[PDB]
Amino acid sequence: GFNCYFPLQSYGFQPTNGVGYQPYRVVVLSFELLHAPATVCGPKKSTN
Amino acid sequence: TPIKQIFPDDAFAETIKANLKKKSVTDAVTQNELNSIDQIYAPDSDIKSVQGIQYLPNVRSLKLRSNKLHDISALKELTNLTFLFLNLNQLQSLPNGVFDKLTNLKELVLVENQLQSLPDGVFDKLTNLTLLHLMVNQLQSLPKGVFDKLTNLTELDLSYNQLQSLPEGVFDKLTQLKDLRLYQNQLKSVPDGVFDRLTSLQYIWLHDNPWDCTCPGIRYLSEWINKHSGVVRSFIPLWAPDSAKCSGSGKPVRSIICPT
Amino acid sequence: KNIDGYFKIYSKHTPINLVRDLPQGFSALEPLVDLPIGINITRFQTLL
């Protein structure tokens, strides 16, 4: 009622709709330097 | 040479000279190089004295977490803003004449709008406002004749309206509203004439929508939907009359024989 | 051992049938496992 509302509302996003109203996927990573030896750096290169 | 009685602000000047982390103190000072910042980002910045600001035009948006600042001087001749965030609860009036040049504003937030009355021609010149974002607005005051001269407003909040007569062409000729909303509408007393002009409808919301059961007003539409029930969609695939659940009772609609 | 942010374990099995006395002789311990742990250690216990 007065000065009260409902949290659950929806706008509507369907996958068959236009490209501007479709879900996407996002993956986010972080880069930092710490005061410890690094155990995840990357691959190496080897020659004959 | 150091001069006394110049700076009123101690914290602001200290944070200006500290956050930048200058090379040393033996450098010179000026105004053009110092005023390169147009958007001040200082938490709980309570700068009140803005008098004589005509010598500093480059600032456009000022952030103020100062509930105490009720001075009208912040909006007497500050018409270059594009964003508004003022926690002035006792705002019973808005200064006039500031719309003479305000054309660079993009998005505004006006919460707790206690204006029970609205002025004439307030939005008349705002034809350039091609994008408006107004949410959780408390504009209980109903506009009186604004659609027939302005077709430029896009987003509106029209909750708790008892209009028995909708404006003509409010959704038909206004082709610029490619985003049309009718989600979980609770208009129990729908105006007569809604279903006719919506032949361009794309976003339909019929599932769990509690339409009335007035015999025999909506009966013809329900029969037509029943004859062509294969084109509609719902959350759960069930019988078509089940989606148009009768208000309150919910008993099957095939028991009462409506007299002619 | 736990030094320089690394945990090291050396071990060796020596077959000698003796009672109540540590057997004499010489036997060096070969490294077994190295751990990149890098934490603070002061005490230890056992799973008796």
Curated annotation (Swiss-Prot), chain C:
> Which positions does UniProt annotate with glycan attachment?
N40
Q: Per UniProt, what does mutating A28V do?
A: In strain: 20A.EU1
Q: Which domain of life is it from?
A: Viruses
Functionally, this protein is described as follows: Attaches the virion to the cell membrane by interacting with host receptor, initiating the infection. The major receptor is host ACE2. When S2/S2' has been cleaved, binding to the receptor triggers direct fusion at the cell membrane. When S2/S2' has not been cleaved, binding to the receptor results in internalization of the virus by endocytosis using host TFRC and GRM2 and leading to fusion of the virion membrane with the host endosomal membrane. Alternatively, may use NRP1/NRP2 and integrin as entry receptors.
Under the subunit heading, UniProt states: Binds to host ACE2. RBD also interacts with the N-linked glycan on 'Asn-90' of ACE2. Cleavage of S generates a polybasic C-terminal sequence on S1 that binds to host Neuropilin-1 (NRP1) and Neuropilin-2 (NRP2) receptors. Interacts with host integrin alpha-5/beta-1 (ITGA5:ITGB1) and with ACE2 in complex with integrin alpha-5/beta-1 (ITGA5:ITGB1). May interact via cytoplasmic c-terminus with M protein. May interact (via N-terminus) with host bilirubin and biliverdin, thereby preventing antibody binding to the SARS-CoV-2 spike NTD via an allosteric mechanism.
This protein is called Spike protein S1
Source organism of the structure: Severe acute respiratory syndrome coronavirus 2
Complete protein: which residues are present? 195 to 242 of 1273
